[PDB]
Design a protein around this ligand. Structure first.
Ligand SMILES: *[C@@H]1O[C@H](CO)[C@@H](O)[C@H](O)[C@H]1NC(C)=O
Ligand SMILES: *[C@@H]1O[C@H](CO)[C@@H](O)[C@H](O)[C@H]1NC(C)=O
Lengths: 147, 164, 218, 37, 98
């Protein structure tokens, strides 16, 4: 749903861009030839001005939302480029970066406009209670485990 | 019936946003508070039509007196039972209320629970150590690119029009 | 301030003591879920204005879509940060954590079941046109229930609860693991546990003062 | 003779009632620390 | 004239909201990362979880935010010494293990 959500957002933004052609923006008609034929050039210029200004903003808005959206994808392409340098091309020690567990390795899989990481992690299981001791004394000296 | 104490010569009331707030009645010199009559949005809480066609309607920021009828912080919830239990969130509503379609079956509206309780048997000499393991393989999906779309000025705005 | 290290080709400097300093980092995580209506803001109670607005098409079918996506995302921001642990952990009724004192960060039942420090942060930081402010999905009582699970899980289990089944370990012993992870042997902590517990407790106490003294911290 | 009008000459420009607000308005006011004849 | 003026005023507000909300998402992703790596495990990234050698961190909630208390170990009371890469005892070079 992450890669699909990217596709829908772009298509809806483009469809909204097209459908804005069927708006008067305070002019008489939304068709360029209809307003041209119906009226005289001295008057059609005002109606031409109303449409183009309405269509400039509609094009201006689309690019701005594209610049904001494209910067949201660059922050995901920089994370995926980082999850491949550190998870795939080496073993990670950053917690929850390459999956929930103790990271072992990862395998990239491509996808349409995206990438899928399969994070192989080692998960402990079957815990058992025990009794611990910071150190043990045998000959009047304290012994600490090495590892 | 307001509570502000206007000055002797004052007939208006205003907020920081320069919006009219209180008025002094010219006939009886009593100050009146003005609150706009309730507005908001309507949201339809529903399980999938693949499951059922029974929906619950929520009116946002309403005291239920302007519209079986549950009143929350998000607004007046109509058509959903209120349960005193607490399950995982299914359909968010707001302020911790999550509605869900469950057992016949109808739409409930509970307060979501923050996971299953657990308390670690912690002492000052007890340690737990794993004895086995599992090799779990999880999947992570990340978008990396978009569609390279370009739009022309002349064709989009003034398609086939020299005058434009 | 100027400083020049007395560097030679056979001189090395080695520390002999240490301090356990506790610093504070503040990060914004969410905003207010604000929505604005087209008809009420632009043409509030005006049929004539509303009819002419329809000539612009769906300019503000987008805006209600843009402002909603922000709001449904502001709830994701809060969910990624806190909602990371599954089981809601709890501290034991006893508090003999090797001599370390967590009363200033752990919830106290003498209150909003927040802690001492969380309350300092909450005390410190303090419509006619379709300006509807939506409520956050996780109320602040749930969020502070989440940070108690992380606090209680850390104290009793260490890092073993974010990686799988939660395995308990004494807090005096867990810090020996933490010390051993920065190049310092275990016996440094055990031999100086009494000094270290006081250094940890003293440094935590200064946190409340540092927020309480100057209000520009948050 | 001339004298210094320290802080006086301030009036209510309207009827409206504002509570704990630092309102800023442009109207004919007596300039501060002026010369009163 | 009014509605066009009010469309732009509403159009501007949403755009500055989209830019500002993306500045908070970059802080909610950092706080989500400072909790996975500082709180739920011990970090070895320098200056990530406080200035020092990281030991552990404790989250504290706040209104529209989060506060991390980064417990770090700071060395102190340095003493000069004289070092040697290796020592020879029997015609062989000895290097310290750790
Ligand atoms: C709704 O109105 C009732 C009057 O019966 C009042 O007591 C109550 O406080 C109101 N509730 C809200 C949530 O505003
Ligand atoms: C005006 O004010 C100044 C200083 O504020 C004072 O010296 C002077 O006497 C006053 N009067 C005139 C007529 O300048």
């Amino acid at each position: 749903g992450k890669l699909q959500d990217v596709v829908n957002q772009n298509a809806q933004a483009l469809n909204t861009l097209v459908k804005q052609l069927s708006s008067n923006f305070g002019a008489i008609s939304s068709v360029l030839n209809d307003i041209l034929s119906r009226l005289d050039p001295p008057e059609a210029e005002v109606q031409i001005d109303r449409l183009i200004t309405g269509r400039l903003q509609s094009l201006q808005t689309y690019v701005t939302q594209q610049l904001i959206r494209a910067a949201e994808i660059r922050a995901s392409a920089n994370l995926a480029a980082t999850k491949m340098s550190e998870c795939v091309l080496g073993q990670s020690k950053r917690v929850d970066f390459c999956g929930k567990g103790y990271h072992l390795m990862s395998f990239p899989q491509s996808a349409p406009h995206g990438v899928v990481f399969l994070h192989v992690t080692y998960v402990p299981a079957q815990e058992k209670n025990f009794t611990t001791a910071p150190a043990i004394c045998h000959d009047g000296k304290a012994h600490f485990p090495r590892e | 019936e307001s509570n502000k104490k206007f000055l002797p010569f004052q007939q208006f009331g205003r907020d920081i946003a320069d919006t009219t707030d209180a008025v002094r009645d010219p006939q009886t010199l009593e100050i009146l508070d003005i609150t706009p009559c309730s507005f908001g949005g309507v949201s339809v809480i529903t399980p999938g039509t693949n499951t059922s066609n029974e929906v619950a309607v929520l009116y946002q920021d309403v005291n239920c007196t302007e519209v079986n009828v549950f009143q929350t912080r998000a607004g007046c919830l109509i058509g959903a039972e209120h349960v005193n239990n607490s399950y995982e969130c299914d359909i968010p509503i707001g302020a911790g209320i999550c509605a869900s379609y469950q057992t016949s079956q109808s739409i409930i509206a509970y307060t979501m629970s923050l996971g299953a309780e657990n308390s670690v048997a912690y002492s000052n000499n007890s340690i737990a150590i794993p004895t086995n393991f599992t090799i779990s393989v999880t999947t992570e999906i990340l978008p990396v690119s978009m569609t390279k779309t370009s739009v022309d000025c002349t064709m989009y705005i003034c398609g086939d029009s020299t005058e434009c | 301030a100027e400083n020049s290290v007395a560097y030679s080709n056979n001189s090395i400097a080695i520390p002999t003591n240490f301090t356990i300093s506790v610093t504070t980092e503040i990060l914004p995580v969410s905003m207010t879920k604000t929505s604005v209506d087209c008809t009420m803001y632009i043409c509030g109670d005006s049929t004539e204005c509303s009819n002419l607005l329809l000539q612009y098409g769906s300019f503000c079918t987008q805006l209600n879509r843009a402002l909603t996506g922000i709001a449904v995302e502001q709830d994701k921001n809060t969910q990624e940060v806190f909602a990371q642990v599954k089981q809601i952990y709890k501290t034991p009724p006893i508090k003999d954590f090797g001599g370390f004192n967590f009363s200033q960060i752990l919830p106290d039942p003498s209150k909003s079941k927040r802690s001492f420090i969380e309350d300092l942060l909450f005390n410190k930081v303090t419509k006619f046109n379709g300006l509807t402010v939506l409520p956050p999905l996780l109320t602040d009582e749930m969020i502070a229930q989440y940070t108690s699970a992380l606090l209680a899980g850390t104290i009793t289990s260490g890092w073993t609860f974010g990686a799988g089944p939660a395995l308990q370990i004494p807090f005096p012993m867990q810090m020996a693991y933490r010390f051993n992870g920065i190049g310092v042997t275990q016996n440094v902590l055990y031999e100086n546990q009494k000094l270290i517990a006081n250094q940890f407790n003293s440094a935590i106490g200064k946190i409340q003062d540092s927020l309480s003294s100057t209000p520009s911290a948050l | 003779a001339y004298t210094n009008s320290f802080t006086r000459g301030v009036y209510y420009p309207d009827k409206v009632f504002r509570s704990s607000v630092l309102h800023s308005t442009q109207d004919l006011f007596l300039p501060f620390f002026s010369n009163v004849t």
